């Protein structure tokens, strides 16, 4: 499990900025912090982990101070730029911790400027990273004088992160360990070749295996697409295969997934199940 907090700040000009955050525990979202909201929102019933209400309110007040100070601090620091105040400015932060067994973990805090990684927090201090703009040297020196900020960040990375997260993992156990079954279906489009598509939708957790098969042979030309999210936090994936016309005959799409309890989905091209599916999904192509 990788716990990640992601902040995205946009600074258009001297008078306009916006900061938005999201928090992820593996691939489930646990928090949202919109720029228009004074407070961090829970996106799960268990998003408070094992912290008390007054403890949660203390962590939050801390971040509420951070969000205002970050904004003012950047607006000053952009005066120090190579051509001064080179708006628009995009800053991204990615902080968090990888959780391992049994209670072992590694923390990170990465910062990007214009889509480019430039700064990390490391041990006790901020560091520019190879290839960072030279004008960042003075800002980082200045920031590194703030030992109060540095003690807070160290405490967040070393202790608050892994501890908060071990409670989230306990409180969120049934959601994190949920199994949702993929449903599969077939279709085809032109490439004198055709392109066959196996659509696999609604699986959780994320790892699946989807291959085009001819009997027991794995068709090595199978191109597995990207994992695409659905709105209910299940996943969607298609696998495709380029075949000459009159060869769909005999191919199947096999799907293996933890939720299927040992019984794979196998869809044969041309099968009664496929024909009855295709009848339900006919359309005019314009």
């Amino acid at each position: 499990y990788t716990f990640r907090c992601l902040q995205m700040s946009s600074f258009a000009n001297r008078s306009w900025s916006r900061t938005d955050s999201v928090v992820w525990l593996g691939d489930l979202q646990t928090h949202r912090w919109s720029n228009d909201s004074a407070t961090i929102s829970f996106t799960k019933p268990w998003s408070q982990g094992k912290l008390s209400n007054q403890q949660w309110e203390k962590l939050q007040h801390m971040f509420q101070v951070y969000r205002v100070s970050f904004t003012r601090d950047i607006q000053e620091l952009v005066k120090m730029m190579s051509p001064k105040e080179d708006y628009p400015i995009e800053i991204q932060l990615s902080a968090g911790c990888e959780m391992y067994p049994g209670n072992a973990s590694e923390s990170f805090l990465h910062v990007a400027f214009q889509g480019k990684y430039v700064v990390r927090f490391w041990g006790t201090s901020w560091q520019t990273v190879p290839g960072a703009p030279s004008w960042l040297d003075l800002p980082i020196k200045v920031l590194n004088a703030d030992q109060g900020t540095s003690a807070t960040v160290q405490m967040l990375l070393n202790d608050t992160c892994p501890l908060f997260v071990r409670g989230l993992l306990e409180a969120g156990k049934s959601d994190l360990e949920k199994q949702e079954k993929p449903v599969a279906w077939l279709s085809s489009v032109p490439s004198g070749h055709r392109q066959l598509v196996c659509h696999v939708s609604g699986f959780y957790p994320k790892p699946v295996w989807v291959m085009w098969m001819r009997g027991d042979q794995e068709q090595q030309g199978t191109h597995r697409g990207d994992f695409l999210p659905n709105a209910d936090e299940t996943w969607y994936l298609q696998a495709t295969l380029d075949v000459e016309a009159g060869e769909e005959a005999g191919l199947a799409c096999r799907v293996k997934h933890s939720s299927l309890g040992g019984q794979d989905i196998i869809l044969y091209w041309g099968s009664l199940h496929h024909i009855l599916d295709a009848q339900k999904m006919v359309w005019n192509h314009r």
Partner: T-cell receptor, first 108, second 110 residues
């Protein structure tokens, strides 16, 4: 945005002085200055919010729940008479924002 | 640690006045403040590094120049009566505590 109080204080040599500085931001650092009229601005104390105070006749402390720090003068002498100015930085990037000062008169 | 010159100045309305501040602390920032009795300092201009200048809170009537790491000047191109004040230079590393110069009393007169 930085407030000092009282605006003036009179006291007898030997008495302790306490001077307040209230502010409405985060506290990176507090700097106190001493000045006689038409004189230079002399640094008395620099205290970052994370540093330990160094004991002596002149010290500072932050109020517990409150955005407020004090200057403490032990056993005031006639030569402590002058103006005391508070300045607050809110972060390592901000400006040093100055109060309007306390007039201290130590009388024999 | 921080010096200023001249120590004192009397000028006429419309005159050009230059105040100089000097430091060899290896400091990054330099500042110009004015003080009016009485008594908080107000920031006029400041600077991060050689050859750049940033406007403070009350920059109207003043220009600043940072010809090198060591030197920071405040220029009043057309002195006016409202510029009668004491001026303090200051410097700092990063980062840290501000060190102040001894001040210059300026009197602008008809």
């Amino acid at each position: 945005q930085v407030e000092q109080s009282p605006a003036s204080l009179v006291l007898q040599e030997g008495e302790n002085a306490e001077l307040q500085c209230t502010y409405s931001t985060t506290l990176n650092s507090m700097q106190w200055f001493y000045q006689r009229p038409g004189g230079r601005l002399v640094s008395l104390l620099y205290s970052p919010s994370w540093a330990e105070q160094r004991g002596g006749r002149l010290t500072s402390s932050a109020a517990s729940n409150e955005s407020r720090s004090s200057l403490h003068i032990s056993s005031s002498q006639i030569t402590d008479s002058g103006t005391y100015l508070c300045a607050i930085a809110s972060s390592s990037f901000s400006k040093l924002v100055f109060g309007q000062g306390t007039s201290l008169s130590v009388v024999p | 640690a921080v010096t200023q010159s001249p120590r004192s100045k009397v000028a006429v309305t419309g005159g050009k006045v230059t105040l100089s501040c000097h430091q060899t602390n290896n400091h990054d920032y330099m500042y110009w403040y004015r003080q009016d009795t009485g008594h908080g300092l107000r920031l006029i201009h400041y600077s991060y590094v050689a050859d750049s200048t940033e406007k403070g809170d009350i920059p109207d009537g003043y220009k600043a120049s940072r010809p090198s790491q060591e030197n920071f000047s405040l220029i009043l191109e057309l002195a006016s009566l409202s510029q009668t004040a004491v001026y303090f230079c200051a410097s700092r590393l990063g980062g840290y505590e501000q060190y102040f110069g001894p001040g210059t009393r300026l009197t602008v007169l008809e």
